[PDB]
Design a protein around this ligand. Structure first.
Ligand code: HEM
Ligand code: HEM
Ligand code: HEM
Ligand code: HEM
Lengths: 141, 146, 141, 146
């Protein structure tokens, strides 16, 4: 469960991200595809080169979903319901990959938030990304 | 992965008793039932709408037999699983785009099928040897991903 | 979530375990310690040899907790509340190990109850054990 | 794990700028804050119940310095991580009873600490090299478990 402090920490960190959310989403994906090449198996229809339009566009979609989750941190299952349906019934990504993307999102935030990425905020962001991942895999079976 | 000589003997003895016509389709079928998101890779196989449809699907049975034959190749080359599975690793990555995590799921389903099929004979030490085998097969199948 | 069919399947399969619950729990633990030796790091104070009294007694505890969870499948978080407190605050087993024990419980049931262990029941049991594991790690952080 | 010459160069160049007195305590502290069940191994450190208590704890800092010193030793032997860490692997298994899954968590946090400290210089290719390193160290530390 996300605590009151977790929610404060996540909202503050995401507020600092600001207009860079989509850029950071794309960077996290690039980090994931390079560090964890098995994740590329889900994107055989993408140009995965650095700076590709498809990775930029998809990173913005990931970022917007995370922003939606932050804005609805009190009831994420309801806010992410349509996206969780799409993951369960169509995308069908193995759950382990959510931990890989979550780690790469943390690395990206760490690399861009020198003051904000304190130990407490790191812990809260990890819990938040795990909670999002749990919602997105909640309808798999 | 390294099995002891005793483990190699035990895995070989049990495998000689495996029904090569059923066990592969049972493991693949159970993968698709227990982890239904894995059906994404088999849309061309037809009806996968219920457990009975999955287990009875002739394409699941036929493909499971091919998977089991590859497992048999690994059991015949336990000291070189990497080389045994290198071509299939490249295929599953480059052509089929299969996340290797699925190999671990299938391996543990296969262990459950072996336990179901062999009962008391699938002892805890025999299982431990087969856990080494299925981990080694999964690692070898993952090795050529890039 | 556990569907009505899942709950029916789990109650029937675990009901056939019956008075063997403790023996089957000890066997599942032995399978886990031999197949996944890193799990032994949680039991340095145990004799882990085949047939040891401590493994038998601990296997009964695991099995009885599972029987209680089956009996309370409609409200497992409440039924397991004290046990999840103990796991989060004292035992502190890394979450990966719950999947190892769950797999070994499935293997044990498959080896002992072949008429019960149909594909559908296998699926329901795997979901149930994952759900128990989720409850037991729900208070970790 | 084996690293290409370019990855080795990138790892070594970044590590030459890592502060030996600081990064280890920061990584160990973040491990204990982010994954608080890991505090089970460190009762003798005293209060670990808040981020401030963990991060300022002098035993966390002193121990983290030793952990990262051993990590530094591994970076001098990247082709022989299993041999280099065999004695420490035996210690963590036989004396300390540490589940090796924790080694992967510490690697996670160390990568985050390097990214936090270095910022943009911790590029996606540099991270990928360090992911191979931390996986190799974790695997080496797990290797003598039995
Ligand atoms: C925090 C975790 C994640 C979030 C918030 C997220 C979000 C999204 C969103 C918003 C979409 C577009 C949905 C739509 O079209 O309506 C999408 C699509 C997709 N997701 Fe992600 N996702 C996550 C994790 C993952 C992971 C871990 C993978 C695989 C490694 C993945 C693979 C895909 C794929 C393949 C698509 C389809 C993209 C396309 O064809 O354009 N997702 N996801
Ligand atoms: C873990 C052990 C596995 C082995 C030994 C194995 C082996 C094989 C073999 C021998 C083939 C046929 C190659 C050919 O005809 O040239 C094949 C094809 C295939 N495999 Fe695997 N496989 C394994 C796991 C998996 C898993 C877990 C999945 C997906 C969840 C998968 C997905 C596929 C697909 C989609 C095909 C092509 C099927 C078709 O032609 O319609 N494999 N595999
Ligand atoms: C289905 C999952 C599990 C269930 C239902 C379960 C149940 C229990 C119960 C009922 C107890 C005794 C609680 C008490 O004293 O009041 C216990 C203790 C314990 N559990 Fe398990 N557990 C599970 C998974 C695990 C796993 C995966 C591990 C580690 C690999 C583990 C390690 C321990 C340890 C070390 C103890 C203390 C034993 C002792 O000191 O006597 N548990 N568990
Ligand atoms: C890259 C990973 C790691 C390295 C290189 C490492 C290295 C070391 C070293 C050098 C020591 C001192 C040994 C001695 O004094 O003889 C030590 C002790 C210890 N380590 Fe690790 N370690 C790692 C990860 C971990 C993790 C993840 C945990 C637990 C979550 C852990 C738990 C301990 C404990 C409990 C001690 C003993 C501390 C004490 O005496 O109070 N280690 N480690």
């Amino acid at each position: 469960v996300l605590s009151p402090a977790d929610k404060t920490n996540v909202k503050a960190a995401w507020g600092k991200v600001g207009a860079h959310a989509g850029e950071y989403g794309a960077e996290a994906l690039e980090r994931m595809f390079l560090s964890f090449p098995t994740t590329k198996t889900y994107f055989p229809h993408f140009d995965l080169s650095h700076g590709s339009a498809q990775v930029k566009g998809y990173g913005k979609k990931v970022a917007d979903a995370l922003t939606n989750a932050v804005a609805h941190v009190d009831d994420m299952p309801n806010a992410l319901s349509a996206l969780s349906d799409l993951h369960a019934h169509k995308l069908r990504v193995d759950p382990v990959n959510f931990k890989l993307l979550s780690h790469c999102l943390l690395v990206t935030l760490a690399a861009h938030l020198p003051a904000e990425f304190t130990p407490a905020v790191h812990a809260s962001l990890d819990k938040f990304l795990a909670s999002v991942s749990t919602v997105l895999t909640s309808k798999y079976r | 992965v390294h099995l002891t000589p005793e483990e190699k003997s035990a895995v070989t003895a049990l495998w000689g008793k495996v029904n090569v016509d059923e066990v592969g389709g049972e493991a693949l079928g159970r993968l698709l039932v227990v982890y239904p998101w894995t059906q994404r890779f088999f849309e061309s196989f037809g009806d996968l709408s219920t457990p009975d449809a999955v287990m009875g699907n002739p394409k699941v049975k036929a493909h499971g037999k091919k998977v089991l034959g590859a497992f048999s190749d690994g059991l015949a080359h336990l000291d070189n699983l990497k080389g045994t599975f290198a071509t299939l690793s490249e295929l599953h990555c480059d052509k089929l785009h299969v996340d290797p995590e699925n190999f671990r799921l299938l391996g543990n389903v296969l262990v459950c099928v072996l336990a179901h099929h062999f009962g008391k004979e699938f002892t805890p030490p025999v299982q431990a040897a087969y856990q080494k085998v299925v981990a080694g097969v999964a690692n070898a199948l993952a090795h050529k991903y890039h």
